[PDB]
Amino acid sequence: QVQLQQSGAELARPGASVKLSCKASGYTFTSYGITWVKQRTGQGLEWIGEIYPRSGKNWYNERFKGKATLTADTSSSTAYMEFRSLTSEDSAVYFCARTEYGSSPQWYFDAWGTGTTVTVSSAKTTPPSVYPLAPNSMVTLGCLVKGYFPEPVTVTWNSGSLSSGVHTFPAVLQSDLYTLSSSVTVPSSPRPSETVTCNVAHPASSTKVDKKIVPR
Amino acid sequence: SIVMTQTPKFLPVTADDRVTITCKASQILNNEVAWYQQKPGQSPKLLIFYASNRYTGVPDRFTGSGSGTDFTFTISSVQVEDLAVYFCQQHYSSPYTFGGGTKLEVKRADAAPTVSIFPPSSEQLTSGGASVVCFLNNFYPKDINVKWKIDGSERQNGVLNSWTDQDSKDSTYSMSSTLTLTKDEYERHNSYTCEATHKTSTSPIVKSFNRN
Amino acid sequence: QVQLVQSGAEVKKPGASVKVSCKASGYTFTSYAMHWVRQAPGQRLEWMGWINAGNGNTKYSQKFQGRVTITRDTSASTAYMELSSLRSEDTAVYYCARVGPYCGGDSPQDNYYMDVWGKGTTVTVSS
Amino acid sequence: EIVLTQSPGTLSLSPGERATLSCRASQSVSSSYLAWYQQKPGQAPRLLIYGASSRATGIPDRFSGSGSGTDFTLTISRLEPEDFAVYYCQQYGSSSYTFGQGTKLEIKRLVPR
Ligand SMILES: [Cl-]
Ligand SMILES: [Cl-]
Structure with a gap:
């Protein structure tokens, strides 16, 4: 089983540097190459460069030569990519992948790694402010989770007893913080008669909040 | 930087439909085109390499063909487990570049x-x-x-x-x-x-x- | 285990053509180049041409341009060598050989020797 | 073209002795583009040395490659009966791929003693 385990999500400040890890297992590390691909959330892939661990020889995309540096440690079967002078444009998911090799590098990648999410920001760990959202047969309620950093948060409704008719929207960046929203739809008889509560947790700040949706 | 124009960007499908994805290159290649599958929140998986060759484990409903400038990736009968984003990639010359992608959705x-x-x-x-x-x-x-x-x-x-x-x-x-x-x-x-x-x-x- | 299995011996008349096959197994066929070599009775090893099993590009010897045709079949992991308008001097053993694996050196040219050889295909041009 | 001239054409030696084969190129060739091969009668050639001095997989230590430029040398430390065969050198640079005429390593015939 080919496997490329990538380090945890990196959080760096602008102008700082980061070094991503890519530990390989399930095959002979020195028999293949390791490329790195950039993927900004919601769009295509971008090739960064290549390294051949057995010899250390590396190829680069001209766009990343000064910013990225590819190394590898055959003793630990780990590939590294160091980024310098980080900017908001560098925030993305970074994959490592194993490259096919024969009589020469083939430059297509048959095994991809976990994926490391890099966030370039100066924000500090901030807990969310959870705000209820209140206004026929159905009733739609909401839960506004605003001003937290970093990702992620978890959201449930009545401790999970409300699972159908629920969907949470992706977080957006608002004032260098994250803002999220969750929607729950229940029959109009259950509420306002029977309480509806949104359970929000922000593991990074070690905060839990339960906000009851009150009618106006 | 060779450009791989991949179409369509968005494709609604019904189960068992024949999917056909096109990928045109900005210059003449030989056959160095690969295809990848990426499900939401997952890593890409290689499906086709050198335009026509399936990778280990790929079902037979996935095919690929083409040469020079025009390349096509076909699913004989799309399945629910095939719903995902599909990328072409050119492994002809550096820098190696991917297509814009093709996202499938369930027709409704x-x-x-x-x-x-x-x-x-x-x-x-x-x-x-x-x-x-x-x-x-x-x-x-x-x-x-x-x-x-x-x-x-x-x-x-x-x-x-x-x-x-x-x-x-x-x-x-x-x-x-x-x-x-x-x-x-x-x-x-x-x-x-x-x-x-x-x-x-x-x-x-x-x-x-x-x-x- | 890397193996190149060639087709059986051939006996042709002058003017005919012959196509030799080279079934490859034990490695990614499309990731390597392949050489074709012949050796006439009591003569040197003679290079004829190589083919990129991936894209199919070929380079032929100038002693054989026009007569030799090297092709590939990725679906079958088989290379082919066709020699047309045969003459007595073409009586020889024809070999297919895969090149070596790319070490991380200057260029793949550092490993375009004949790493793995086939066992040979005898072609005899008589009458 | 790059012509390779091996010498001697025939080398008659006994087991235990040292054999020295020479491959001379008409032009300067990079060491990384020089290969040696061994061919026993009826068999197919076998890779022996690549890159002028790198042994192929499963090649005894008594085989050693050397040289550079226009003069390359294959040396067999101590001859074993399995080592008597034909030996070809090859230049596999970008230009073209050419073999030498080959050295015929024979078993020396002796007078009774
Ligand atoms: Cl990820
Ligand atoms: Cl080898």
């Missing part, structure tokens, strides 16, 4: 968005801020526009939007638009409105509330 009957507007909560107003939230839930197709109006005056700045992916159950889409003001300006106006423009209706779906 049209559905109008259930619109719901929520005024700022009492809790939030204790912080000098006010967020008006608008939900546009369970509509198809995905294409939709949301417009805000304060006392009938269109509002642009301060509006952040967010879209869900296609729901696994009802195969619908949902959106949330959030107008965020200061408590000061929020109290300078009376009515607040979000208008949803969707192909299911020639006139927008309007929801409003009065701060008083």
